[PDB]
C-alpha cells in the first residue's frame, strides 16, 4: 500500500493508498520489475497535460498476476505478464474506428500516471486482463522485457508511422531509448540509410547497434545543413521525431524529401505551437505528411513485440544501462530521469 | 507573340516574346478558354516563391494543338485538349517514387507562370505532349472543361488526401472555386455531413449545391467553437484547407477529431511558420495525420475529371460567374482576382 | 416464443424457443421490421455453411429495444434502433488486429442465422448493445432503414474493397439488391463509368437508379466480351462481385485490367474451387488483386451508413419491390427469396 | 554477335544476330555477369507465355556501359551497372497508374527474354538508360550483384506485397532464390516467426540464414497440416507463394487466417487455374486477400536494393552455390537451372 506519486506540479514522493481490487474483467499485479519514463518528467515538473494530485507514477512494468476477475479468462494468479503502458478500455466507438489509443478520448488508452495510478507500488491495477496483458515467455530476462510495455512500442511506432519503403533512407532524430527503438524499427522495415541524430556517446553505441549507419552530432553544425551534404541535397525519405523542443519539427520537415514523410512519438511539453517551416513544406504543397502518435497497446501489440524479441530480430537489453533493486531505489531511477547521467539510457528496477 | 506576363514583384503587364519551339516531344497550343487563379496572386504580389522577370503567367486553359514534334503520336494540329496545371517531366527519379507533382523539384510538376512561361499568351509551350495532354470531348462546354486543368483537380487532391470513410463527417475550410470542387470530392469519396466554411453568398449558395449540409460563417464566432458545437464536442473525422492564412491550419487541428486527418491545398504565401497547436495536436501523439500537396496532373488525370464530368459525377459550370471575351480581357480576369468582388467564384476568358 | 427457424438442410418451419434474456452488457428487441436474405437460402438449402438445428434465421432488423442489461449505458426500453447483420464480441484478439467480422473465428461476427437465433422472431438478442446498435432517426421509415443492416454494408464494402480512384470505371458483376448498393457504393467512391451487369429489368432499372451508366446483359452474350468492347479492349479498374457462380471469380479476373482489383462480396455456396484463370492473371504477376469479405458491422458503421441516408447520399427504398403485413408473412417472404420471380429485388415485412 | 537464345518451344542454342544500337535514350551494354533463371524454363520448356523464334535468353545481368544515345545524361561508356530484368518504357498510361511492371500491357514492362532479346549475348540493349540502369558500386562483387535484377526484387516484392506487420507470422511456400529472399524480405518487414516449407538441404540452410525460424518438409506430411500444428489452428498472418504448382494457391488459402494475407510471386507455367477453395477463404467473404506481381525494376528499385546490399542489411551471395566463367558456360550454367541438382540454388557465369 505504498506508492512514489506527484503530489503536485513540480512535487513528487511516496504516499499511501488503498491497495485497488480488481473488477470482473480487470486483474491485479505486483511489480516484478519497473522503468522510469521521461513522460512523467514532461507531466511533473512540466505541467503538460494539467494539474495533478497525489497520483502514483509510472507505467512500464512487467509483474506477476495475483488477482483476477471472475470474467478473466486467459491470466491467473501467479501469472507473469508484460503490461503494456497504454491500456484502453476496448468497448468505445475510437476502438470501431481503429484508434484504441485514443479509447474515450484524447491520449485516453494510456491510463497508467496519466488518469490512473502508475505501477510504481507494490500492485497495480490492469483493467481488462484477457485484452491488455501478454504472457512472458521463461526465455525472456526481466530487464529487457520491461522495454517492451513502453520504449519498443513507441520506438516502433515511429518508424511504422513513417511508412518507409525497402532501401529507404531514415533519418532518427533522437536517439534516447525511444529513438534506438525507432532506429531498430526502421531497420526492422528494411531502411537501407540510416541516419542517427544525438550526442551521448553511450547512446551512439547504441544507436549503431541497432543499425544507423551514420550519426550526425549538432557540433559540426547545423543539423539540417549537415544531413543535406550527407545526401547530397535530395534529403531523407523519412524522418523519426524521438525527443527535441518543438523546433525539431521545423528541423524534420527541411531534412526531409518532397513525398517524404515526418514521423514524430516525441511527447512535447512546453510551447503552445509546433513550427512547420511554411517554404520547406513547400507553401503547403509539398508532400511531406506529418504524423505524430502514441504508441499502441493492449495484448497484441505486446504478443508482437515479444515475438520480437522471442526471434532475437531485435536485443532491447541494451537500452537498460543501470540495473536498481527494492522499492526504494524506484525514487532514485525516477530522479535519473530528471537530471540524466552521461552513460545512462534506461533504468530499470528490479523487485522479486 | 504577345502575352500578359509578371515583370517583376508586384508589377504585370504585356511584354513581347518569341513564340515557342517545341522539342520532338512536345506541343504548341493555342488557348481557346483560359482562366485566372488566386495562385498567381499569391506569386506576383506576395513574391511567395521568388522573385520573377518578365514570366508569361497563367496556368488553366484548354486549347488547339497548332503543332507537334516529330514524336508525338496521340495528339495532331487542330485536336482540342485539356491541359492539366501540372505538366511534369515524367522521366525522372521522383515519378519513379510516385510524386509527379515534384518532378525535378519541389513543385516542379508545376510549370505554367512558377518555372515556364503560362497559357496567358498566343501560343504556350506544352512538354510531353502524350504524356500531359488529354482530348476534350465535343460534349463538355469550354467554360466547364476549363474547371478541369487546376480548380478540379486541387479540390479533389483535397478530397484524396483527406482519406474519407463512407458516412465520415468532413469540414471544408475555405468556399472559394477549389473548396468548392472540395466539398464535391469529399460528396464523391463518400462523405456524410460535409460542413463548409465561408461567408460570400454565392459562394454559400455553390457549396450547398456541391453538397454541403451545413455552413458555418464566422460572424457567429469562432470556427472551432461553432464546428464543436455542430458536432456535439465529437469533431469532424476530417478537414480540407482550401483558404485562410497560416492560423487556418491551427483551427483545423483544433476541429479534428483524434485519428482524423488535416488535407490541405491551400497556397501559404505569406509567413514563415505554420502553426500547429501543441495541446490539440495530443502533445505530438493525437494521430491527427496533417497532409499537403499540389494538385496532380498528366494526361490521366485529366482523362479521369473528364469522365466525372461526362458521367455527369460533378458539374464544374457552377463556378463560373463571368464569362469574359478576347486576348485583351486576360489583364482584366487577372485583376479580378487580386480583390474578389462578392458575387465572383471564377472568371473565365473566352477567345475564339 | 414464435420463430421462423432451419429445422436442418434443406427444411425450414415455425418453432417454439424461450425468450432470451439478456447478460449484463446485452439487449432484447422485439423487431419493428425485417426482411430475407439470399445468404439464408445458401445456408438452408444449400447447406453452404454445414447442417444447423432449430436456429432461427434472418440478420436484417430494425426493432424496438425492449430489455437491457444492467451495463447497457445508451440504450433503453422504447429506442427504436437500426441492428447490424454482424454483431461481433469486441474483445478478442482478432478485434485488435482490425477484423471484427471474424471476431472469435472466421465469419464469427456475423451471428444471427449463422451461430445464433436470427431476428425472424417474437423477440431476439443483441450482444453488447452499446457497441453493436444504433438509434435509428425518426426521419428515416421502417422498409429504407431495414436495408442498412445488411444490404448497404455489404454492397458499401465490395465498393471500399474495390479501392476505387476518382473517375475510374468499374464493373458489378450482379446486380441483386448487394450489387445495386455496389453500384450506388462506387458511385460514393467517385466512379466515372459503372457498367453493371445484369438482366431482370426492375434490378437494371435500379442499377441505373444508383448510377450505373452501362448495362450488360448475361443472357445476351458473353460477359467479357461485352465488356471488353465497351472498354475498347481495355478492361476496367474494377470489378466487384455480388452475384453468380463460382466462375464469375474467372469472368472478374479476365475484364479488370493490370493492377486493378476484384473485389468479392458474393457468398458462394457451392463448389470446391473458385477458378481463377491462370494466363489472365498474368500467370499470377498482374497485380489484379482479388479480395473478398463479410460485410462490417457494429454500431459504428450502422451510425455511418445512416448518415449517407439521412443526408440524402443513398436512397435505399428502391430496393424493396415487397412490403408485407404481420408475423405470419415472413414465411412468405423468405419463400419470395428461394423463389425469385421477375419483379423481386428485396422484400420488407412490417410488425409495427 | 554470338547469342544464346530460345529456337522455339522446347530447344534452345546458339545462334548469330547484329549487335544493336540504341536509340538516343538508349544504351547498349556488355555483360560482365549473368544468371540464368527458372522463368525462362517455364518460357522456353512450358511455354507459358506462348511460342517466341531466335529469342536471346536471360534477364539477369550486371554489365559495362559501351555505348549510349545522344540523350543519356547519367552514364557513359565504362560504367558498371546493375540492369533491372523489368526495363519498362517509362512514358505510358500504365506508370500513370502506378503500375510500370505493366507498362504498354500485361507483364510488358518485363522484356528480356520476353518481348525482347536477353542479355546472353555479347551485348545487350537496355532502353531509356537514364531510367533503367543503377551504377554499381565497386565495394560489391560481381556475383552479389547479379542477384539484385531479378531474385532479390521478386522476393522483396513478395514480401512487400504481404503487408507485413511488425512481429507477424509470416510463411514461405518454397524457398528457391526468389523464395530465400522472400524470407529475407519478409525479415526486413519486420516478421516475427518464419516458416519456411522446402526440402533441399542447401536451400533449408539459405533459408535458416536469411530468417527462417521454423522449417516444414512437404515429406512429413502435407504443409497444411503440418502449419496448423506449429500455429495451434491459428495460421500464419500472411503467405508468401515462392513455387510450387498451381495447388500451392489452395495451400495458401488454407494456411493464412482471416484478414491475412496471400502475396504471390510464383511465376504458374501450368494449368488452366489456380483454384481458391472455397470453404477456406470464407466461401467469399474471410478477408483473405490475394495479390500477385511481376517485380518492380527501373533504376530507383535497384538503387534502394544497392543501398540493402551496401549497408549489409541483405547479403544475396549466399544464393550463389555455382560460378563458371566463359561465354560459352551460358549453356552449362542454363541446363542447371533445367535439371535442379539438389546442391543448387543460383549459378552465375563471369564473363569479365
Ligand atoms: N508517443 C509515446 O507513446 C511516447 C512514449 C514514451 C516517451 N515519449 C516521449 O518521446 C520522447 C523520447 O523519449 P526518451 O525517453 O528517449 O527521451 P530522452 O532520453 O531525453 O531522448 C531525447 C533525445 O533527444 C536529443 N536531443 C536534444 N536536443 C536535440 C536536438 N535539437 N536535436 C536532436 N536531438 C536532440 C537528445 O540527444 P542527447 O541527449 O544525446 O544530447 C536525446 O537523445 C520523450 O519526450 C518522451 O516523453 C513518447
Ligand atoms: N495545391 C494546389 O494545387 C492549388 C491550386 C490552386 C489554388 N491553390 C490555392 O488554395 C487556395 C484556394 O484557392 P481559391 O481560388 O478558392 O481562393 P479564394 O477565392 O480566395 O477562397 C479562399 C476561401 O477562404 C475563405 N477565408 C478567408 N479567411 C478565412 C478564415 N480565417 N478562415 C476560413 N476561411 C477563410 C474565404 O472566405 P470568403 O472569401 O467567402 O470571405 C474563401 O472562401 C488559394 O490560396 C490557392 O492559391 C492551390
Ligand atoms: N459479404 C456479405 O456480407 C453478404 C451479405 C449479403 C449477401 N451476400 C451474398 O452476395 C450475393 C448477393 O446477394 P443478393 O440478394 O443481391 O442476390 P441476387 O438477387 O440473387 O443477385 C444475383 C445477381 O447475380 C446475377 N447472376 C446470376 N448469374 C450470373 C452470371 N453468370 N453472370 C452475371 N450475373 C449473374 C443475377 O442475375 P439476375 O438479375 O437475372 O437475377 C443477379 O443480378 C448473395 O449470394 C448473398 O448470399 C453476402
Ligand atoms: N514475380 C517475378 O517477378 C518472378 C521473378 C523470378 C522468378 N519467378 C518465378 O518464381 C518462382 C520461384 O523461382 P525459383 O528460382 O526460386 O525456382 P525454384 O528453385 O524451383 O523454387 C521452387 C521451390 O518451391 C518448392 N516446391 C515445389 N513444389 C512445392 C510444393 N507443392 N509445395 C511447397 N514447395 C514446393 C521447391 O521444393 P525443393 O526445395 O525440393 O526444390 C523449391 O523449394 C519460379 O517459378 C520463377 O519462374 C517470378
Ligand atoms: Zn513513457
Ligand atoms: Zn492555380
Ligand atoms: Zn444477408
Ligand atoms: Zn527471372
Known amino acids: ?27 491485479i499485479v505486483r511489480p516484478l520489475a519497473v522503468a522510469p519514463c521521461t513522460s512523467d518528467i514532461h507531466t511533473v ?35 507473469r505478464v508484460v503490461v503494456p503502458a497504454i491500456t484502453p478500455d476496448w468497448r468505445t466507438s475510437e476502438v470501431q474506428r481503429g484508434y484504441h489509443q485514443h ?14 495510478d502508475g505501477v510504481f507500488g507494490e500492485f497495480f491495477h490492469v483493467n481488462d486482463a484477457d485484452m491488455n496483458l501478454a504472457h512472458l515467455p521463461k ?18 511506432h515511429g518508424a511504422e508511422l513513417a511508412d518507409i519503403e525497402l532501401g529507404a533512407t531514415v533519418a532518427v532524430l533522437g536517439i534516447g531509448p525511444v529513438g534506438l527503438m525507432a532506429v531498430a524499427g526502421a531497420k526492422l522495415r528494411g531502411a537501407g540509410r540510416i541516419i542517427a541524430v544525438g550526442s551521448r556517446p553511450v547512446c551512439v553505441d547504441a544507436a549503431k547497434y541497432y543499425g544507423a549507419t ?3 552530432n549538432y557540433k559540426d553544425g547545423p ?35 518532397p513525398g517524404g514523410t515526418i514521423a514524430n512519438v516525441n511527447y512535447f511539453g512546453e510551447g503552445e505551437v509546433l513550427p512547420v517551416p511554411r517554404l ?44 536498481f533493486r527494492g522499492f526504494d531505489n524506484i525514487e532514485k531511477a525516477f530522479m535519473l ?16
Not at 499511501?16 to 480488481?22: G, H, L, N, T, Y
Not at 515538473?45 to 479468462?73: Q, T
Not at 493492449?298 to 508482437?304: F, I, K, N, P, V
Request: hydrophobic share 45%; net charge neutral.
Open 1 to 27: 500500500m505504498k506508492g512514489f506519486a506527484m503530489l503536485s506540479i513540480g512535487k513528487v514522493g511516496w504516499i499511501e493508498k488503498e491497495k485497488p481490487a480488481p473488477g470482473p474483467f480487470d486483474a
Open 45 to 79: 515538473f512540466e505541467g503538460a497535460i494539467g494539474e495533478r494530485h497525489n497520483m502514483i507514477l509510472g507505467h512500464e512494468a512487467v509483474g506477476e498476476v495475483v488477482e483476477v476477475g471472475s470474467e478473466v479468462k486467459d491470466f491467473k494468479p501467479g501469472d
Open 103 to 116: 479509447s474515450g478520448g484524447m491520449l485516453a488508452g494510456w491510463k497508467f500516471s496519466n488518469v490512473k
Open 139 to 156: 526465455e525472456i530476462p526481466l530487464e529487457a522485457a520491461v522495454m517492451i510495455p513502453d520504449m519498443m512500442t513507441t520506438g516502433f
Open 214 to 216: 551514420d550519426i550526425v
Open 223 to 257: 543539423i539540417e545543413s549537415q544531413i543535406m551534404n550527407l545526401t547530397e541535397g535530395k534529403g531523407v525519405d523519412a524522418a523519426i521525431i524521438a525527443g527535441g523542443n518543438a523546433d525539431i519539427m521545423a528541423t524534420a520537415v527541411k531534412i526531409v524529401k
Open 280 to 323: 520547406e513544406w513547400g507553401c503547403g504543397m509539398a508532400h511531406k505528411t506529418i504524423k505524430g502518435g502514441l504508441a499502441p497497446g493492449g495484448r497484441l501489440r505486446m504478443e508482437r513485440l515479444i515475438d520480437l524479441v522471442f526471434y532475437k530480430r531485435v536485443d532491447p537489453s541494451k537500452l537498460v544501462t543501470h540495473v
Open 337 to 352: 530521469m530528471k537530471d540524466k547521467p552521461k552513460d545512462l539510457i534506461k533504468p530499470v528496477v528490479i523487485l522479486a
